[PDB]
Amino acid sequence: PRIDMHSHFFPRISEQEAAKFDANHAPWLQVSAKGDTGSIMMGKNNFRPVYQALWDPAFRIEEMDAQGVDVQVTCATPVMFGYTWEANKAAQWAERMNDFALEFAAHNPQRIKVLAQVPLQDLDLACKEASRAVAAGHLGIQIGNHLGDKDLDDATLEAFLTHCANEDIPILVHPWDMMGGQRMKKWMLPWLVAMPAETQLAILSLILSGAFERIPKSLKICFGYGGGSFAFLLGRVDNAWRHRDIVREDCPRPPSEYVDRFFVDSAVFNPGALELLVSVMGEDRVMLGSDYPFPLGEQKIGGLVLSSNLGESAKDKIISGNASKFFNIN
């Protein structure tokens, strides 16, 4: 069996639909008359051209069959987060998007699973949408590491993760591209540099703030893309904790001891990096993800994990075993 817990979709909306939310700030799908090709737009302009497999659940069950992929977990493309929008507006938007997600999943609920998006800017609306969308069939939630243009240390954020831990709602955290602001303007430097750094920051912020000593152990939380640069830079973080007062201030154990409080996906695009990742997190805490169906997504889903020299026991937890437990999937 083979579960891919990192993949994305974008609903078949309309330019007019989106306008009633926002005509030049709300995304929408523009499939051309030629329907095996399209684009995501905002108003007049083109945000992003995209493969058909982003929509069309049957078209996807096709690709999932070519690859050895049985169960896919899919979630919102980051464009639709609306974390910068008005709280009740975004709540309405998240509802619609989450409804679209189930539609997309409805094509085949046994092999296509969905996570929901939430209005993360407002605690109460977020908890509410989290609970609602899960009751309606979502296996969990995907949230951003950012929040529009956000400093990611709020105590409402602990409140939120605690709500999810209590309701047995698993969480996937997925990065944004913003940190160096007006540097990194070329060559997708935001994806190559800013994002892995933002993800490391989201993790360390939970660790070094002592959040894990307050969030119940029942919390199931996973960080996309191998947790960014976290695994590689862990040694430096542990060194700092050991030799500097201010690093220990709110975090009573060594930072590397908290790896048992979270998961990461396997999307690190390199054998050596995967080995190191597994060594750091353990074979129980890494889940296969592909970022499907994007160009950057791994071409042979699971190819990396399979091609490695990890134990056969290890390869199985990563390709199926862990995601089964995490998302409660058969």
Place this chain on the structure above:
Amino acid sequence: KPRIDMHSHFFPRISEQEAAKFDANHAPWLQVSAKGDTGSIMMGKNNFRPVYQALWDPAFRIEEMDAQGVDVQVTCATPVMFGYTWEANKAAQWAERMNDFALEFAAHNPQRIKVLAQVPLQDLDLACKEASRAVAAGHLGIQIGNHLGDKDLDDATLEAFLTHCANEDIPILVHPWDMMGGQRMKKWMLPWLVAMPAETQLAILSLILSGAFERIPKSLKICFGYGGGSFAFLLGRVDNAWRHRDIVREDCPRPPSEYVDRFFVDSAVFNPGALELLVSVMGEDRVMLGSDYPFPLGEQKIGGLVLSSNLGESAKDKIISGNASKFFNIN
């Protein structure tokens, strides 16, 4: 078979009143206590950082080197001394002053203490002149910061400076400083833990992805601090993006991973699995032992991580001594 540490810092005996003449708020100076074993780097009347004697006392430092089995240490300015935001002429006088201090520091024992120079990088012409002057006077190379405000290493001015050093056979160490982030990562030393390895990665990728290595002569000897930051680990993600996205291929003719033959990194990565990955990405010829001595987060036992890693003995030899002897021309 000299054991060489190539990443270390010094700070000169500068008085508050001397530093005031350059900048009453932003020029760093050194305040030493009464017993004289400890002190602080200061900035205006503000305390900047606690330090100890090894930073400013070459005699004391030699004793510590003796106790660590370090035969030769290459040392350079503490990055707070860079002054990249100052008015160019003033920064050029500062650099020459600091560079003379460095040589006086090394003059205690120039067989075991080597120095790299700083340059007024905000003015290309003055930077090039200072680089050449300092190396002529006995510096083995230059240490620079990894960016100048919003100018990364791919900026025409920085590529121009690098080309000058390549043509003059002046080795370069690139050190992170003035980390990105803003108001986002103040506490728990996050700028050191997050922004700095990303800054270093960004510096390396800026050279690679802009095609600057196609334009800079192969004779350039350039080393990046702290193992290249998170560069080695994220290099799969970069090669993938290059393979499947055109705007990434734009100015970079070969796959990014192939440009590892154009630079070096130090070994300060605080973890043996990390160091092993580094060496497999870079090659055993392109990693040099550096410790960040004498700062608190510096390696407590110098070379200790390298000796305790799974690397072959020949790789260990190169990392500990051979690579730096060749890079800095130490003999």
